[PDB]
């Protein structure tokens, strides 16, 4: 019932349209740290601690 | 398929629109089939699960 049938005379029949969609996404910030003293490095038993 | 495109401008500027502010694009074709041996087309009709 919806086929776009034309005739010999043409004319403005069977007009169509279009649409589009919008997607989105966002970024976020992260991080962490740790502290130490010089003595915790120099006098520690393990020289590969850091 | 025959595709006819007319962009807005002097291409579509006529006595019904001196400014040529609109365009269009159309597609048309002819199609038909000749069924020679209908008995060689087989069809089963059945219900389908949800």
């Amino acid at each position: 019932s919806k086929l776009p049938l034309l005739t010999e005379n043409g004319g403005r029949v069977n007009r169509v349209g279009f649409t589009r969609i919008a997607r989105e996404g966002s970024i976020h910030k992260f991080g962490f740290f740790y502290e130490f003293t010089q003595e915790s490095i120099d006098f520690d038993s393990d020289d590969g601690l850091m | 398929f025959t595709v006819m495109t007319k962009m807005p401008g002097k291409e579509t500027a006529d006595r019904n629109d001196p400014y040529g502010e609109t365009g269009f694009s159309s597609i048309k074709w002819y199609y038909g089939i000749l069924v020679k041996r209908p008995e060689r087309l087989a069809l089963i009709k059945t219900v389908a699960p949800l």
Partner: protein
């Protein structure tokens, strides 16, 4: 080796994300001192991790 007593010792370094990592260095995202300093440790729960 001789002249070192009867015992051998060795260190094991725990990963940061580990329930075995119990330390007092934890400061949370708000800047407040917290009991654990291993983030979510060994947890696999989405709610707890978030």
């Amino acid at each position: 080796p001789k002249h070192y007593g009867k015992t051998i010792k060795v260190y094991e370094y725990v990963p940061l994300l580990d329930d075995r990592n119990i330390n007092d260095q934890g400061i949370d995202a708000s800047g407040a001192t917290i009991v654990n300093g291993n983030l979510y440790g060994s947890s696999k729960d989405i709610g707890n991790i978030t």
